[PDB]
Design a protein around this ligand. Structure first.
Ligand SMILES: Nc1ncnc2c1ncn2[C@@H]1O[C@H](COP(=O)(O)OP(=O)(O)OP(=O)(O)O)[C@@H](O)[C@H]1O
Ligand SMILES: Nc1ncnc2c1ncn2[C@@H]1O[C@H](COP(=O)(O)OP(=O)(O)OP(=O)(O)O)[C@@H](O)[C@H]1O
Ligand SMILES: Nc1ncnc2c1ncn2[C@@H]1O[C@H](COP(=O)(O)OP(=O)(O)OP(=O)(O)O)[C@@H](O)[C@H]1O
Ligand SMILES: Nc1ncnc2c1ncn2[C@@H]1O[C@H](COP(=O)(O)OP(=O)(O)OP(=O)(O)O)[C@@H](O)[C@H]1O
Ligand SMILES: [Mg+2]
Ligand SMILES: [Mg+2]
Ligand SMILES: [Mg+2]
Ligand SMILES: [Mg+2]
Lengths: 401, 402, 402, 402
């Protein structure tokens, strides 16, 4: 019956940011530990939460000389270590001899409660033809992860087959919301592989929900920065399958990977090494199957207009090959099987913007491309979705809608 | 609390596509149309509903050789008549001698049930005012009202009317064009007057709550206005409830440069045409200030490049060969001028001007004049579930209950 | 029958190239005007041929410091005089104090046989009227005549005159500029009024038969107008014989906005200058409608850097500092206005191309006025082998005698 | 003598437009709609004429969802088969699962008289070379022959073949495609090797005499290839007879890098397909030098935006995923490579235009390959009335009999 759009209404009147100023202020007044002295080994950062609270506390001394920050492990000579650090992204990485003490970043940083960590400096900036790509783009006899989805004006990738947690518990799929956005045209109807104005295809369904920006305090549960206009890039859209659409054609398998497990949630208190440095893979309609490494979490970026933006996952492709191309947006970021458990998804690729970023890891090599991913655990929670991972579970879920 | 956007549920499958084909199919085969057209005078079109149903019946024969259509009065020698007609928009209006019989549009057309009307041909296609009023609207005035410049981080618009929601807690707020609120590149939820914090000073007006972009014709008008099953009405409107912080003492329900307005005058499709078509209208917008024009036509059909049919409710042409609006006027109130002394009533709001918004030629001596697109305010408030507040006392009363 | 294009046979390889060289070679028995500088008044230039042969003799020295040249009357203080002169076009006219004597033009020149003339220096260089006449020309009129818009799939032009071919079948058709027809991107020999089938409605007029683009000076004028052996005259003509299906009852030999015209007035190079230079002319074209102007100069020389000499027959400047033409008028008849009561006779058609958008400064008070390029109609009809039809009765006689 | 261009008289409007309609009216009357016993193998399409007649008959539904069509052999798994088929070019080739029955192209089609064929779906769409051969063609060699760069003032092209005219004095000259000859701004009738005088050194080869741009299908093929009454064949050719001064001692009838060629191999539409479709071809051009490719299809249909049907004779794809030609090769001879020791015979010349070359996908693993357009040389020489000279002795003999 409703003919209008409803905004996400996460305003939480300014107390959710009034508490932000008061949070960092009241921690600021309590400096008992005493003078510049090193810090004990027992209080070393261990979790993602630790690194994020340390970085947020010193955001403003870090922001001044930096393009951004992220949490992870220290990178020395291009190789990841297992040392909890805050990665500071500089425009150009120069020798210490050319820095004044105000500019030179420290080697250690102690946050609230004496929790300390390392500070790593990284130099920073901002089609595949295969049998797999053709299958994803409409040559296969099935629709699944990686399949090209399209509205009248935009193309995207189908991330996962999902079901809604609330109400009807409708079965559908998850993709990236910019492929479904209506300002010039109506882009509510999704099709595979092409929209009717461009060529043949099948009507998948109409967009129901979409998140674009969610404040950090809601997304992470903590204040990740001092800026009161802080948003998380939380791109995701839920499209319930059309009442006519033939569910027999959908597959819960990620083609080129196999049977995947349930979503692996990024718990901010687990030890870092379970996410940072882990090998991930992607199947998308543009680059097909690629392999990469998780370099960092919680990428801070304060932009021209004065708003802080966080990007959850930072992946760099293996062997100096780009992890993704433009158009892979929506693709599932799957943790590769280590000794034989089913590969579990941790995120989806965020829509590549114009002039995507790059970081230099070694002098011998040039700058490599990095890919930005959205936390799948948090996205499914915010969109109120459950991922369907077996073909039998799919037909069971359809029965109850 | 919700963290997501909820898309409008105007899908309505499958009688919205099945019922459209079923509606036009059953009327076409049983015709009994007895070709020699005596067309008795009692069956002449009288309402807007009559013209739209006639146009919809002959949509394909009309769209075949034309850029689009709209309903109204026949235009003869550049002047509006009182003759009910379907306006057919041609790229170039050429003499009959240069048309084959397939191309030449008829002078009369009879629809379902023998209801007939005229067919008029119109040639069709698809800088700042500096004044104290414009400065007042753009932040120099001590108050916020209709015409006041509203802004998100990335886009500027005009405040149309001060409104209150009909449902729930009946929040008081304002109506503007949803193109100011675009969450694709940047979080453009917070609205400000006159400038966003990144560009300059201002006051936080509130956060967008509702917005309509496209509503199917069968929902908006209540009838099937065309044969295309993907037919949408461009209905731009966004509701921004005032922030709790906002000083509602600074709001005025007066339309500066017009005065105290009355309640929304609803466009009833069954009333006689002469109460909308040809009536003089006025607009106060942050770009052109106060302008005056005429309502030329209703229900502008346009079957574009991708194959989707789009309807635009109101078509205004400015008086004295002057543009009725400029870019940036989108959202402004389209007010019916007082023609015997009652309070001027609003009938619509300006729709956000596309790139290369068309022109139309009326007589040979003058070139093409600019036309302005409006959204039906009666239908927009109903769809958004809004009530317009027209007196400063009523505003103080509406703000209390909440 | 023929499926190919036949390029004109005006090559005469090395019959024109050395005949030019020996003409100018066995002239050197000439120069040394020894000794004095003043020449007798009895040998003053009187014709166009006199002025052109003087310019041709001193072409090398004149082209040294100038953008081009033309023949006419000296312009002094912005007004045409009665003094036969060679107009030398400089980019920027500076005071004598800033020129070396080599750069400064002599403002008198004697050619072969002591025929002398003046040298005038002119500063030189290289959006639509809306009216009922324009609308009628562009398809609103019930007839096709001079000024009517003609079109192929990709290009628009103006119908200049209704003509009949002199040779063979003596077919009736019309004359326009060939750049509306000549196309190696597409099939555009088919002409239509007012629009081609891909753009809108219209009637098939007929197919292009012959078209001239460049004609060497020695053929066009009959003399060697310059020393460059690659010297061409811009003669844009196109003869389109009417289709057999075409209703010739719809054609009018009347120039709308001028009236009944007389026969083509031939530009005889030996006549006194004042019969062409300075005469008032008018034009009816599909873009600017009816305009009025003055013939400023003839035989405009322009040597561009690829090394080819190009001549433009007529140079018109619009009256009252108003442009004589706009883009799209190409083909329009350049009609001599009735000065005492005789029928206005046509002398040329407007040239459509690239080097037509140039300006010349006549007075300091206001800036550079626009000039329009015309092709000699007398020479064009001769080269195309056409006769102009000027009365509607003569038209139906020509149609019946095919 | 003549100072004008003569347009081709190979189009007789609406005398032949009815004959096209009548031909399809005749096929539609003797429809013979039957299919009890599936498709006997004796009635299978064998010729190019068979495939073209089937495609034209079912033209309406094929073009409904397609970018174009062509005749040849079915392509299965990226390799040409021996199955007579109609190639339907789709923008993106999707699985049967995603097509409604209206969209899905059939696997077989039987046309008039029960002659049937297959329907193959192909995905379709619409830097320099440095070598000793390229340098020799572009002016470093001591001779002028096939592949040699020819130039007018504004355009560069390739010299295709050394020819003599069949009519009149049987002038000897050369053949290239008319976009190297044709002008809009300059009198670039004169051809030069390797450069025009404005750009650098060269020798004057001669002046263009004839040029074909578009020829209707009924004239070119001898049959009605499509139902559109505005149907044209892309027929780029230009005949430049050698200047009388030109030293014919420097001309070679040899195709450098291939050798001595045989006479033109005429594309007989009634011969078995395998003599053209799938045959290996080679090309020597001033941009890519020597390249090798395969004849993929004949009679490439393309109905563009303006509503005109365009046919392209030969469709070549380069071998081993390498482009068959580059920009500038237009005019080069498309030579059939020797299959069993015969001299390689030329069958066509490369076409130069706006629709020059798009892409077609043959396999999933490696991406889309480039295709090249060729014009039927057998038909081009007939239309221009030219004979190809293939031996240096025949050249010197042809020179004397002038
Ligand atoms: N603000 C700054 N801008 C540019 N360069 C800086 C800045 N601050 C520090 N650096 C450089 O970065 C260096 C520290 O780099 P980092 O912490 O990455 O070392 P590492 O990880 O131990 O070794 P590697 O450099 O091999 O990774 C300093 O020596 C200094 O030269
Ligand atoms: N498909 C078409 N394309 C272009 N022009 C057309 C077409 N069909 C009709 N016309 C032109 O429009 C004319 C009808 O115009 P219209 O109905 O507006 O006349 P009117 O309103 O009585 O007088 P006026 O022309 O002054 O408005 C026809 O005479 C014809 O010349
Ligand atoms: N090559 C040149 N470049 C620029 N200016 C020149 C050149 N040769 C002459 N002049 C200027 O032009 C003047 C002659 O102009 P022109 O013959 O048109 O004079 P006019 O017709 O006598 O008077 P008016 O200047 O009022 O037309 C010279 O006095 C000189 O200053
Ligand atoms: N209108 C269409 N648009 C896109 N794809 C189509 C269309 N019609 C058919 N197809 C696809 O093309 C297929 C037929 O292709 P084709 O006839 O080329 O097969 P083939 O040559 O036997 O094998 P191969 O596909 O290996 O060449 C159908 O299975 C269908 O999936
Ligand atoms: Mg490092
Ligand atoms: Mg009218
Ligand atoms: Mg002067
Ligand atoms: Mg195939």
């Amino acid at each position: 019956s409703a003919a209008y759009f409803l905004w996400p209404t996460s305003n939480l009147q300014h107390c959710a940011a009034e508490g932000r100023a008061n949070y960092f202020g009241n921690l600021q007044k309590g400096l008992l530990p005493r003078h510049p002295g090193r810090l004990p080994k027992g209080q070393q950062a261990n979790s993602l939460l630790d690194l994020m609270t340390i970085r947020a506390f010193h955001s403003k001394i870090l922001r001044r000389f930096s393009l951004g920050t992220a949490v992870g492990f220290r990178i020395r000579k291009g190789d990841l270590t297992d040392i909890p650090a805050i990665l500071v992204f500089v425009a150009r990485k120069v020798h210490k001899k050319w820095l004044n003490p105000a500019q030179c970043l420290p080697a250690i940083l102690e946050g609230p409660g004496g929790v300390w960590c390392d500070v790593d400096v990284v130099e920073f900036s901002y089609q595949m033809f295969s049998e797999l790509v053709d299958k994803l783009c409409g040559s296969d006899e099935c629709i699944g992860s990686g399949s090209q989805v399209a509205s009248h004006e935009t193309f995207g990738t189908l991330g996962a087959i999902v079901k809604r947690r609330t109400g009807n518990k409708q079965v559908g799929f998850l993709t990236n919301h910019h492929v479904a956005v209506d300002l010039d045209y109506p882009n509510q109807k999704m099709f595979h592989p092409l929209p009717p104005n461009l060529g043949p295809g099948v009507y998948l369904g109409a967009v129901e929900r979409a998140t674009s920006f969610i404040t950090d305090d809601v997304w992470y549960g903590i204040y990740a920065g001092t800026n009161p206009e802080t948003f998380v890039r939380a791109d995701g859209a839920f499209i319930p399958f059309a009442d006519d659409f033939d569910i027999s054609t959908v597959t819960t398998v990620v083609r080129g990977v196999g049977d995947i497990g349930d979503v692996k949630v990024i718990d901010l208190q687990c030890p870092l090494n379970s996410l940072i440095g882990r090998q991930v893979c992607k199947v998308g309609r543009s680059s097909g199957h690629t392999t990469g490494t998780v370099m960092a979490y919680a990428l801070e970026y304060n932009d021209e207009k004065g708003i802080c933006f966080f990007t959850d996952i930072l992946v760099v492709g293996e062997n100096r090959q780009t992890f993704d191309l433009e158009g892979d947006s929506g693709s599932l970021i799957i943790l590769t099987s280590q000794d034989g458990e089913k590969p579990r998804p941790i995120g989806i690729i965020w829509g590549g913007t114009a002039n995507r970023g790059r970081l230099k890891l070694t002098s011998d090599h040039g700058p490599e491309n990095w890919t930005s991913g959205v936390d799948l655990g948090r996205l499914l929670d915010r969109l109120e979705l459950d991922i369907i991972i077996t073909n039998e579970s799919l037909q069971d879920a359809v029965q109850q809608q």
